[PDB]
Design a binder for these strands. Structure first.
Lengths: 233, 118
RNA sequence: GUUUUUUCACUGACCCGGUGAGGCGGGGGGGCGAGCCGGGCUCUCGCUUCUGGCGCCAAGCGCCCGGCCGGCCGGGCGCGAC
RNA sequence: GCCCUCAGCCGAUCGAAAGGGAGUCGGGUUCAGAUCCCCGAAUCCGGAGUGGCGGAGAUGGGCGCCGCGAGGCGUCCAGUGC
């Protein structure tokens, strides 16, 4: 049926028999210094010992509660910068012919109203680069009795309002229509983050080395466990 | 896509060209060295005129910045005469001495009598 | 739980070698052979030793699409170095 | 102009008028110049848009016949050499 002139030619890839093809060499390619540094910086969090003041950043609120908090924060978003100029033009036309409650931002505005006791919920990023801004605020909100959550993405937290980045978000004033849905989130965040802070203080972390070192230790551990099963008996 | 070469090669990223709003200088430089200034004078020596009568050549004193083709173009633009070849030297006094070979249809003594020198 | 000394061993600090930073560590698969009772345990192995040439730009199986009038022409993606 | 695809080298550059280092011989010529000016014969390199032409490539072998034979019709191929 088929043409017998065509011949199968199996090139057996062997040492001294045939040339070897290429391979994905993503570990073997000499990476640049800045790429290698920013890749090993994330490795440094696993290798070295982590104090609880940094280990408290690892607790991240889950997806359903995070999307519910984003949907609740979508209702009280501030207006556009062009709408600000249009409202000023409308005020000028009203003059020629009371603010609504919004959501605050920035630590210098938020932390003052923390001790003034006006906020109800705090939103913090998880991997912000000025890490010294955050540290004292969960320990202080524990004593004040203000719930704080740690969400994913300072960029997407800042791009909700007409800004680029945002450090902390405070929920100061809400209406009666969006009260119970906010109170359920307050109760969930209080049971998640606040009510186990005594275990956060005592919960040490880190000291997780490479998988090659873990396998090399576990091989000798399984070897000793096998030798003790038949050594004396 | 797989990492073929172990050496990290920098890709062809970007470069641009000049798209200015206004140029640097206002008045550009014009042609300063003119055709009347590039050819100074011929030499009226008796032995030079004997060489002109013998081998049908011309001896000019040329500016040092000129080339052998530039002498040909400068003579062809002004006097409208063909040039066979140009042979130049530089005197120890500091002047270039050319040897313009003419074609035999236009005589060198005749073109000297046209311009007036003898 | 706190403090002094000895024994060890890491690695994430520090010192040194080479490269074109080219086949690192585990799980899993296959031929052959071993003891125990066709099942299971782990070990073994992973293509080149006859003479001064050499193997460089894959074959082969599948999964789909476009154009022309069921047939011709031209392409893409996998298995093929778990 | 963009998207695919491919390429190695020891690192810019300087450094020999006794290193490597294409492409002219004779004759006469001025008061001073001769591989330099002139005569007569030559040689190498670069470009060329339609490369302007000669020559291989290039012209043959088999079938049906017409045609006394020459020679030409249709049907299959060979050709980037002896």
């Amino acid at each position: 049926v088929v043409n017998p002139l065509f011949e199968k030619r199996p090139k057996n890839f062997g040492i001294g028999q045939d040339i070897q093809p290429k391979r994905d060499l993503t570990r073997f390619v000499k990476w640049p210094r800045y790429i290698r540094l920013q890749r090993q910086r994330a490795i440094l969090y696993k290798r070295l010992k982590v104090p609880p003041a940094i280990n408290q950043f690892t607790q991240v609120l889950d997806r359903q509660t995070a999307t519910q908090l984003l949907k609740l924060a979508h209702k009280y978003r501030p207006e556009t910068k062009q709408e600000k100029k249009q409202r000023l033009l409308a005020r000028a036309e009203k003059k020629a012919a009371k603010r609504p409650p919004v959501l605050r931002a920035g630590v210098n505005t938020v932390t003052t109203l923390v001790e003034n006791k006006k906020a109800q919920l705090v939103v913090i990023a998880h991997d912000v680069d000025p890490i010294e801004l955050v540290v004292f605020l969960p320990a202080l909100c524990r004593k004040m009795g203000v719930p704080y959550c740690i969400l994913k993405g300072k960029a997407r937290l800042c791009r909700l309002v007409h800004r680029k980045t945002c450090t902390t978000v405070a929920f100061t004033q809400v209406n009666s229509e969006d009260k119970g849905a906010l109170a359920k989130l307050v109760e969930a965040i209080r049971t998640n983050y606040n009510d186990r802070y005594d275990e956060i203080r005592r919960h040490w972390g880190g000291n997780v080395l490479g998988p090659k070192s873990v396998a090399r230790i576990a091989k000798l551990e399984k070897a000793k466990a096998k030798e003790l099963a038949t050594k004396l008996g | 896509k797989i990492r073929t070469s172990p050496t990290f090669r920098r890709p062809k990223t970007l470069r641009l060209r000049r798209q200015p709003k206004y140029p640097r200088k206002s008045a550009p430089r014009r042609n300063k060295l003119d055709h009347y200034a590039i050819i100074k004078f011929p030499l009226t020596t008796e032995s030079a005129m004997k060489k002109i009568e013998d081998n049908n050549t011309l001896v000019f004193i040329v500016d040092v910045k000129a080339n052998k083709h530039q002498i040909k173009q400068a003579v062809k633009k002004l006097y409208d005469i063909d040039v066979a070849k140009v042979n130049t030297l530089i005197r120890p006094d500091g002047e270039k001495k050319a040897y313009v070979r003419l074609a035999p249809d236009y005589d060198a003594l005749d073109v000297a009598n046209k311009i007036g020198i003898i």
